[PDB]
Design a protein around this ligand. Structure first.
Ligand SMILES: [Mg+2]
Ligand SMILES: [Mg+2]
Lengths: 244, 195, 235, 211, 233, 204, 240, 222, 231
């Protein structure tokens, strides 16, 4: 019958690894690099679009950085279509929580929820896992500014600075070298762009190959603002930091 | 399981609930505690149809205790009240609704403020300085409207509460067998054992 | 791959035959039926000295008149025990009486072949079900993952089973006392066990009409072990 | 019907009448309104006999399964709650049940009132049935915690007699039970007809009735 | 739950020494309107059974189709379908009784009263009643509706108990049945003159008589009846 | 018994010259008993304003529902919902409960951010849209409000003149209704400024 | 629905999926449990391959199931969350239906049952997780420590370790832990738990987590400095 | 509106002796004022030395008896031909009845036989399955006419020993099977006189260790 | 070979190997004999023990007062199929007040087994059955194979070494069919038939199992000292 054609997506290897999770991680290692850096006064999200064209409409384009709500955003590395399925589910969870408790969802609770959905696809159902790794940048009034990552296994961890996608080994070493705890957003912006500029597989880092975002309490008084950078604004910050 | 009162003073919320339970023409109990602790700084009193009251209250308690363990964090009184309201709004369009009215008295440790929420069985929520359910308000609100200040001490709140109970005991036809009084403040929940 | 409910060319179910191999790796369990009662004994086999051995529960009560010992993948036995306890108590609810040992055993064995593509595989554990009822007296049954159950005068299951069964072949007779059966289980357990038998790595139990199912204290078993040592040194 | 149960120093007394009626017709003179759930737990029975019998006989199943799983005897609080939750499943459906779950566990003697509404009340004294008001009068005026087993047994017996006399739908005979930590002890069946005359003479009560 | 629309009135029957007789009129009433005059309410099953049905006609036609299907089904993979494994009156009744009680238990009854008349393999007479409630009973005489009130008293004068059955011939039994049908025509406002009659005998088999009429009626005495009390002319 | 008059309350909306106004009372009651004098019935999602009268639990539920839906709309569309679009969403959402409806009388008010055109709309409890040019009324004193608005209203009123008209329409209507009053709020809405005013009124 | 039998017997009577799940546990960071006379201590390894980690928000290795019971694990991190959630739900469900909190043994039996179920249900794979469950029964001062594994078997331990290099730390515990006289105080119990991890851990910095559970719902997690003082005192005695 | 219930009349009587039991019932079946049958058996031998009658609505009565007979058959299949004891049968019938708690079998059920000590046994059920072991029970139409007579003549209620004047009760001496049958016949003869639904015939099933025996007696047919 | 992985696959020669393997399980089973006359039908079964401490596995199962069978192969499959027969016999009695014809019982067993041979996921039954009964057309004997094939016979045998008993019955055909109104002689012929299949072991008191049904004889099973008369 049908058994013949079953790849069995949810089995251990003899070494105790999940084949499909490992292979999904291999896929993600070829995706454009995304970086997150947490500072005392905000969070930075920086990401590289994959080998683009001059005819691509950049100002209406979005493949890396997505808004989950007013307080939480994600950077994507992997299959964009897979990511959008999960992103829409996360957006719904955030609104479910807000409707139930009349408070914005804490960052970790949203992260745990999405990570549990990823986990399920590795243990039951016989379906392929989502080929996506997320960097979560968010704020709530319990822990303040937070960075998380999740991968196809459904495992998630918290970070001061982190990269996903291509060249994460090189990127993480560079971040580990220059990162300090008393760092500010403007410094973190520079670190993120400098790290991408050194790890990129492209010849040079330009505005049309980047997506950029910040989460700042640089919003008038005790509140948080999300800023998805426009193409011209990415071009300006590249000149300011002295990369172009 | 008819009379439940609430008053929010300067630094605490006070809930007063009757002790009587009646089955038919006989009073079965005169020491019944119509309340459940949802979290260390959140107390809920209840009144409505027999059975439904305790079942609903304990169901809410279990859910808040579950949340507390999962997140290692106490939900704000506002968050708890919204959860409770949704459950009742859900319930009113069910096959057999839970005929339960509640008062939620909590102390918000973040804002350092006492808070009193009144929610009826339809899911009608209001935040009030003082509240009641059923006909209880008909006898007591004129006294509360007159004497209440937002800067009252806990002791003054208890005295105003005594006056409300005395008026109930005078003009209500039913013997509700006195009230159990509990105080919710920054230090948690405690019962006034002489009232 | 191949179906879970597939027959071999010899006319046997592969999965059932393979589960029997898992039971062969299990710790030894022995049962002896007498006219004074049925004795059940097990090898605990703790994997480390830091493991508190009294938490090893391989002998289990099903009802007051029915006990049970297990060998193999012992985790699989929990749902079987739960079903057995439910079946015993449910029959009492429906009929205001004790359930027959055979009927209880048959109810457990009905679960066995409920696997396919129901549970995904057979059970990897064998059970010795011992009990008493008014119709057939003291009884001992061997419940397998094949769904088959045999009644036995005496039976051993687990890793030392064929050596123990040969020993039970010679020792059992229809006039055994309860005390004689107890010492006989201890003797054969001591023979097949890797480690030296004592009250902490071996457990005894019995079922009598008067007192029902009882698991023996470590102090009670220790005395029976000392009684065994002396009578073997007596000749 | 008249059933009562009360806590006291050396345990809990359970006393019930024995009458069943179909309108004015007395269908039974001797129904058993105490169910021996197990050797440590008793349940009274008012409302629908079938509902009481079926659901408390089933409660015994659950309490036995509890002991087999956990190795300990179930508490009076837990047992009473299992019963109250079965009721809430058939809430609104017409079940009719009012009983006192009586037992002795770790916290000492225990007594819970459970009805078809799901109500579950812990207490020292309870009475249900068409003659409960009469029994309460005798109970409230004579009840002490300091009662002896002998006097407590008589109190529960006398309280049912009071109800049997005045309530038309209570009578027949009185069944007594005493619940200890070692289990319940049955204290016999007592015909109300014979008991009334006996109590009238010895006690001097019921002067208005000619004997 | 429904209400009967098109309806059939009494079915009457009795046992005699060598078999059973059953009869029913050919009317299908629509309330007080005598709407349909050619309705057959006796339905034979094989050569040993006749099922007589009163009440709702749409449900009768449904039952008629069930019985037709029953004969078809019995013949499947059955070499002895016309011999030892043929349908018995008792099999047919028990099936109908099962259906009737099941339908009332779902609160959706077949709104009928049914009498199954026949002769068993061993020659024994079979006569049993079942209705919309699933109620069943047997008696030497059986009748439905008005027949129960008017026919049974007349038929019971012939066979009053079990011991009267061997003393009752087919001629005496048929005579009693025919007279009862006349009495019902005099007194039941939902009856007709035309009726069917079936005899199931252990020797002569099934005799089915159609287009029978009520005859030998007394009406002449009506000419002398004038007014309602005092009127003379 | 009647779910649409247990709690009481009113909402009124009006159009003016390059502006709209929406107003409501502050009462929540249990039939004769006044329970709250701070129960606001007007909400906003971006620049679109929604007033809701009727059963208070449904007022709260629907506000939470439309906040939920307009937040998802914004995340996907990358823009704030407009009054015309939101009106259709309210209608659709109410009709999906055709045979178990929310017992409410919603009122939409706002200015389209692209055209600058003032917009108001009203609904019955199951979704039927009333898109009036002049004014919309709702609640337990809707008859009274119709009477006030029909005489007091004139087209193309300036924002500060519209304030006086809608305020007097609400106040005097509420003072002829037992189940309305206990305070009042008025929103004056222009293309990029909104002013909120609490009115002084009798408290019986 | 997906019904495929993934956990099946092999000719030699082994269920490879269950055995491969144990290999996932072998890969996981080391976890250790030691019960004293009046306490239980849970120690956990943190691999220092991950720095730039935010330790405030990163999922901690020890999880409270109720106010009186904790759970630590070795193996797949994502898998452990599902078992923890189920356990927490069951704990509240028990309090609601039986009006007592769960015993440690009962909670263990439940988690172990969930693990067993996932070894003979269609369309699912076993949990790649072994757990250590510790605490005190309500109104009881006797320490409790249990272990579960993917197959679903469970048992009580005086002291136990799971995860990578657990063979080594078990070796240490077997020669250092005396049953006749268990660590009499909190200090002695924590010291022995830190000592056991120092056989395997690497640096005694942020690589060792310690959680102490005492009777009557008294649960606290030690900080870096508090643990660092144990690490310091151990090696200064070792220099001799 | 469709009424799923009806009343077929009938009266039944169960009496437990020292080493025997009788279950008796009239053979008349009725609706309203009409007689359906003068002889429609109502008391049935169900096997295992148990006799049963489910009186009231005959359709429900026949259904319950049929299902209990079936339960005896399957008890033999499932439990190695073990004899179903009267107490075990009683508990089983409770579950059959309570299974339709919200749409009950509209019948009053009585079973009779011998207990496991060989002593006479009678069990009595209400429509929803509450039951109990009893010495004496009449059921159905004329139950209220029969029970007071049995209280007086079987249990000797209100009868005292002459000369003592109320001080000493009449002692409860055991009754033979011949004595019980006399009281059964007189109970039904008296019921037939005063109750319109009682008549035609009386069928008695007698249970002893030797088995089940039947006796039939004519009753007045008016 | 490549076509025996499941029941849903024909081989190139049109064979169903899983069904054939299920048939093999019957051949491994202990011998059982069936035979009938015009008044009675008899089952004789050689029971098998695990060892000397164990009981002898029961082979004969009662389905109704007028019908029952004996098994050879997987015993749990016989329990499933006999439970189905018990239900079908019972459905016929309750609904139609009719004892289920033995021939119809065979048709029902055929169809139930067939469904397990044409669908994916399932397996064939691993047991053979000999059904005896007395109905309105007299005594009957049926042989059931888990392929679905059911056959009405005067006599037969299934299990290990069943060929010896089958040849004996083929010789004795004209004799045992005429044994009318004599239950003991018909059983003797069955005990003599099953004896042709024995090697090394002989018929003992706890080894032998016999069943009989007939004109005025309900289906009854004889075990223990009740069969010593025939040894
Ligand atoms: Mg006023
Ligand atoms: Mg009469």
């Amino acid at each position: 019958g049908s058994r013949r054609y079953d790849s069995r997506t949810t089995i251990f290897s003899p070494e105790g690894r999940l084949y499909q999770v490992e292979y999904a991680l291999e896929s993600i290692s070829h995706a454009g690099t995304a970086i997150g850096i947490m500072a005392s006064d905000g969070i930075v999200l920086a990401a590289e679009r994959k080998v683009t064209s001059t005819l691509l409409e950049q100002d209406t384009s979005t493949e890396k950085l997505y808004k989950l709500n007013d307080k939480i955003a994600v950077a994507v590395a992997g299959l964009t279509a897979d990511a959008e399925i999960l992103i829409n589910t996360a957006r719904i969870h955030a609104q479910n929580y807000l409707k139930t408790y009349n408070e914005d969802i804490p960052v970790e609770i949203l992260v745990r929820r999405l990570s549990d959905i990823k986990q399920g696809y590795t243990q039951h159902g016989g379906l392929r896992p989502f080929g996506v790794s997320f960097i979560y940048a968010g704020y709530d009034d319990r822990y303040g500014y937070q960075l998380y990552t999740s991968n196809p296994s459904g495992n998630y961890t918290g970070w001061k600075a982190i990269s996903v996608g291509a060249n994460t080994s090189a990127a993480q070493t560079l971040l580990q070298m220059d990162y300090k705890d008393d760092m500010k957003v403007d410094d973190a912006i520079e670190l993120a762009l400098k790290t991408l500029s050194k790890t990129t597989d492209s010849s040079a880092l330009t505005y049309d190959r980047l997506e950029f975002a910040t989460i700042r309490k640089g919003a008038n008084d005790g509140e948080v603002y999300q800023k998805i950078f426009k193409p011209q604004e990415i071009k300006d910050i590249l000149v300011k930091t002295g990369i172009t | 399981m008819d009379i439940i009162l609430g008053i929010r003073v300067q630094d605490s919320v006070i809930l007063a609930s009757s002790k009587a339970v009646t089955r038919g023409i006989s009073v079965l109990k005169d020491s019944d505690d119509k309340t459940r602790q949802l979290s260390p700084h959140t107390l809920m009193s209840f009144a409505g149809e027999a059975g439904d009251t305790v079942q609903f209250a304990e169901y809410i308690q279990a859910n808040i205790q579950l949340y507390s363990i999962r997140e290692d964090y106490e939900l704000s009184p506002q968050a708890v009240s919204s959860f409770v309201r949704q459950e009742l709004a859900k319930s009113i369009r069910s096959r057999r609704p839970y005929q339960v009215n509640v008062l939620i008295g909590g102390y918000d440790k973040k804002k350092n403020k006492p808070e009193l929420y009144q929610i009826d069985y339809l899911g009608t929520k209001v935040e009030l300085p003082y509240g009641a359910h059923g006909y209880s308000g008909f006898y007591t609100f004129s006294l509360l409207d007159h004497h209440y200040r937002p800067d009252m001490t806990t002791e003054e709140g208890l005295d105003l509460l005594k006056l409300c109970v005395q008026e109930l005991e005078k003009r209500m036809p039913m013997d509700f067998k006195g009230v159990i009084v509990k105080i919710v403040d920054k230090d948690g929940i405690r019962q006034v054992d002489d009232f | 791959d191949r179906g879970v409910s597939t027959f071999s060319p010899e006319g046997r179910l592969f999965q059932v035959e393979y589960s029997l191999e898992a039971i062969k790796l299990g710790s030894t369990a022995i049962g002896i039926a007498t006219k004074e009662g049925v004795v059940l004994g097990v090898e605990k086999r703790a994997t480390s000295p830091l493991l508190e051995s009294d938490s090893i529960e391989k002998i289990v009560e099903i009802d007051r008149h029915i006990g049970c010992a297990m060998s193999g993948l012992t985790a699989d036995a929990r749902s079987m025990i739960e079903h057995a306890r439910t079946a015993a108590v449910t029959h009492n609810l429906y009929y205001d009486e004790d359930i027959n040992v055979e009927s209880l055993t048959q109810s457990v064995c009905d679960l066995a072949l409920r696997f396919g593509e129901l549970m995904s595989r057979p059970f990897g554990v064998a059970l010795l079900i011992a009990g008493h009822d008014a119709d057939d007296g003291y009884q001992l049954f061997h419940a397998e993952p094949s769904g088959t159950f045999y009644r036995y005068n005496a039976k051993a299951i687990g890793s030392g089973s064929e050596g123990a069964q040969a020993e039970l072949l010679n020792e059992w007779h229809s006039s055994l006392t309860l005390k004689e059966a107890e010492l006989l289980v201890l003797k054969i357990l001591k023979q097949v066990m890797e480690e030296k038998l004592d009250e902490n790595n071996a457990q005894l139990s019995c079922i009598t009409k008067q007192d029902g199912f009882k698991i023996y204290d470590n102090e009670k078993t220790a005395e029976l072990i000392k009684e065994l040592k002396e009578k073997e040194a007596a000749e | 019907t008249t059933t009562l149960a009360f806590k006291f120093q050396h345990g809990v007394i359970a006393a019930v009448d024995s009458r069943a009626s179909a309108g004015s017709y007395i269908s039974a003179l001797r129904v058993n309104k105490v169910i021996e759930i197990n050797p440590y737990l008793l349940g009274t029975m008012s409302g629908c006999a079938a509902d009481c019998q079926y659901w408390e006989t089933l409660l015994a199943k659950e309490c036995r399964l509890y002991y087999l799983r956990n190795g300990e005897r179930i508490s009076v609080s837990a047992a009473s709650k299992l019963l109250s939750n079965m009721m809430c499943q058939y809430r609104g459906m017409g079940l009719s049940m009012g009983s006192m779950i009586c037992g002795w566990d770790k916290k000492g003697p225990g007594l819970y009132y459970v009805d078809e509404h799901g109500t579950r009340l812990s207490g020292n004294m309870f009475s249900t049935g068409s003659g409960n008001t009469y029994a309460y009068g005798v109970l409230d005026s004579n009840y002490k915690w300091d009662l002896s087993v002998e006097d407590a047994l008589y109190l529960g017996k006398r309280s049912i007699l009071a109800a049997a006399h005045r309530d038309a739908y209570s009578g027949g005979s009185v069944n007594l039970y005493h619940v200890t930590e070692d289990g319940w002890i049955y204290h016999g069946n007592h015909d109300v007809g014979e008991l009334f005359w006996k109590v009238k003479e010895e006690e001097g009560s019921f002067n208005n009735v000619i004997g | 739950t429904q209400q009967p629309i098109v309806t059939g009135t009494s079915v009457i029957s009795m046992k005699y020494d060598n078999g059973v007789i059953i009869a029913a009129d050919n009317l299908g009433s629509y309330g007080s309107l005598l709407r349909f005059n050619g309705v057959e309410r006796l339905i034979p099953v094989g050569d040993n059974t006749v099922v007589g049905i009163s009440g709702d006609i749409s449900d009768m036609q449904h039952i008629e189709r069930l019985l037709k299907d029953l004969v078809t089904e019995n013949a499947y993979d059955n070499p002895l379908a016309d011999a030892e494994e043929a349908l018995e009156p008792s099999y047919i009744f028990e099936y109908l009784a099962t259906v009737m009680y099941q339908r009332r238990s779902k609160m959706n009854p077949l709104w009928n009263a049914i009498i199954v008349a026949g002769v068993q393999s061993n020659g024994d007479q079979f006569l049993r009643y079942v209705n919309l409630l699933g109620v069943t009973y047997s008696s030497p005489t059986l009748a439905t509706g008005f027949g129960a009130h008017m026919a049974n008293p007349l038929l019971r004068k012939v066979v009053d108990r079990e011991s009267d059955i061997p003393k009752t011939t087919v001629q005496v039994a048929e005579e009693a049945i025919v007279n009862a049908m006349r009495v019902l025509y005099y007194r039941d406002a939902r009856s007709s003159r035309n009726f069917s009659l079936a005899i199931i005998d252990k020797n002569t088999g099934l005799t089915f008589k159609k287009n029978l009429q009520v005859e030998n009626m007394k009406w002449d005495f009506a000419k002398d009846i004038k007014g309602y009390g005092t009127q003379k002319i | 018994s009647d779910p649409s008059s247990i709690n009481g309350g009113i909402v009124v909306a009006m159009t003016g010259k390059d502006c709209v106004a929406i107003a409501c009372d502050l009462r929540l009651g249990s039939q004769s008993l006044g329970v709250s004098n701070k129960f606001e019935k007007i909400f906003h999602y971006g620049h679109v304003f929604l007033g809701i009268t009727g059963l208070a639990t449904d007022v709260t539920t629907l506000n939470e529902m439309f906040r939920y839906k307009t937040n998802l709309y914004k995340l996907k569309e990358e823009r704030a919902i407009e009054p015309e679009t939101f009106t259709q969403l309210v209608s659709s959402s109410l009709y999906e409960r055709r045979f178990g409806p929310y017992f409410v009388g919603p009122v939409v008010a706002g200015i389209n951010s692209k055209s600058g055109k003032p917009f108001i709309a009203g609904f019955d409890l199951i979704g039927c849209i009333d898109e009036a040019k002049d004014f919309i009324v709702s609640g337990t004193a809707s008859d009274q409000l119709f009477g006030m608005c029909e005489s007091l209203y004139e087209p193309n009123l300036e924002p500060e003149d519209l304030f006086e008209t809608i305020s007097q329409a609400l106040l005097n209507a509420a003072d002829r209704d037992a189940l309305s009053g206990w305070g009042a709020v008025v929103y004056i809405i222009k293309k990029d400024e909104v002013v909120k005013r609490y009115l002084k009124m009798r408290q019986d | 629905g997906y019904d495929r039998a993934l956990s099946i017997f092999s000719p030699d009577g082994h269920i490879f999926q269950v055995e491969y799940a144990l290999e996932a546990v072998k890969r996981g960071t080391c976890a250790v449990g030691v019960k004293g006379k009046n306490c239980v201590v849970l120690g956990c390894e943190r691999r220092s391959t991950l720095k730039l980690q935010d330790t405030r928000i990163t999922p901690s290795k020890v999880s409270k199931i109720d106010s009186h019971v904790v759970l630590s694990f070795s193996g797949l991190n994502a898998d452990s969350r599902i078992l923890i959630e189920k356990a927490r739900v069951e704990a509240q469900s028990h309090r609601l239906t039986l009006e007592d909190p769960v015993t440690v043994e009962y909670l263990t039996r439940y988690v172990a049952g969930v693990q067993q179920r996932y070894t003979q249900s269609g369309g699912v794979r076993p949990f790649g997780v072994s757990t250590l469950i510790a605490g005190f029964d309500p109104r009881d001062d006797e320490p409790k420590l249990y272990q579960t594994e993917p197959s679903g078997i469970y048992s009580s331990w005086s002291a136990q370790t799971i995860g990578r290099n657990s063979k080594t730390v078990r070796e240490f515990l077997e020669k250092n832990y005396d049953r006749k006289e268990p660590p009499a105080t909190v200090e002695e119990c924590v010291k022995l738990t830190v000592r056991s991890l120092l056989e395997v851990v690497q640096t005694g910095a942020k690589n060792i987590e310690i959680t102490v559970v005492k009777p009557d719902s008294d649960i606290v997690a030690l900080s870096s400095e508090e643990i660092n003082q144990y690490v310091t005192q151990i090696e200064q005695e070792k220099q001799e | 509106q469709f009424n799923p219930y009806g009343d077929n009349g009938g009266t039944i009587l169960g009496i437990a002796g020292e080493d025997f039991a009788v279950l008796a019932g009239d053979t008349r079946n009725i609706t309203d004022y009409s007689i359906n049958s003068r002889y429609e058996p109502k008391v049935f031998d169900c096997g295992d030395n148990i006799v049963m009658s489910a009186n009231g609505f005959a359709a429900d009565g026949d259904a319950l008896v049929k299902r209990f007979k079936n339960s005896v058959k399957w008890y033999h299949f499932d439990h190695n031909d073990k004899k179903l004891s009267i107490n075990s049968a009683a508990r089983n019938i409770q579950h059959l009845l309570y299974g339709k708690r919200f749409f009950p079998y509209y019948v009053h059920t009585i079973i009779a036989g011998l207990d496991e000590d060989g002593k006479g046994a009678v069990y009595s059920f209400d429509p929803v399955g509450s039951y109990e072991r009893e010495q004496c029970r009449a059921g159905g139409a004329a139950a209220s006419l029969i029970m007071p007579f049995l209280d007086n003549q079987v249990n000797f209620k209100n009868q005292y020993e002459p000369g003592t004047n109320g001080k000493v009760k009449k002692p409860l001496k055991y009754l033979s099977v011949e004595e019980v049958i006399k009281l059964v016949r007189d109970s039904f003869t008296s019921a037939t006189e005063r109750h319109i639904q009682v008549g035609d015939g009386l069928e008695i099933l007698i249970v002893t260790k030797d088995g089940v025996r039947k006796e039939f007696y004519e009753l007045k047919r008016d | 070979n490549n076509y025996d992985g499941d029941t849903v696959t024909f081989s190139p020669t049109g064979r169903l190997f899983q069904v054939e393997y299920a048939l093999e399980a019957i051949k491994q089973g202990s011998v059982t004999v069936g035979l009938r006359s015009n008044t009675h039908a008899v089952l004789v079964a050689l029971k098998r023990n695990a060892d000397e401490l164990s009981s002898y596995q029961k082979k004969i199962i009662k389905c109704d007062e007028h019908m029952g069978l004996s098994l050879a192969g997987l015993a749990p499959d016989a329990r499933v199929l006999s439970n189905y027969l018990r239900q079908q016999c019972n459905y016929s009695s309750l609904v139609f007040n009719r004892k289920l014809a033995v021939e119809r019982a065979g048709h029902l067993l055929c169809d139930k087994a067939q469904k397990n041979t044409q669908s994916y996921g399932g397996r064939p039954y691993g047991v053979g059955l000999l059904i005896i009964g007395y109905d309105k057309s007299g005594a009957h004997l049926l042989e059931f194979q888990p392929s679905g094939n059911v056959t009405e016979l005067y006599g037969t045998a299934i299990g290990a070494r069943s060929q010896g008993a089958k040849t004996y019955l083929e010789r004795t055909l004209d004799t045992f069919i005429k044994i009318d109104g004599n239950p003991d002689e018909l059983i003797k012929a069955g005990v003599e038939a099953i004896s042709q299949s024995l090697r090394d072991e002989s018929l003992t008191v706890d080894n032998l199992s016999i069943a009989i049904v007939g004109k005025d004889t309900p289906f009854t099973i004889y075990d223990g000292e009740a069969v010593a008369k025939y040894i």
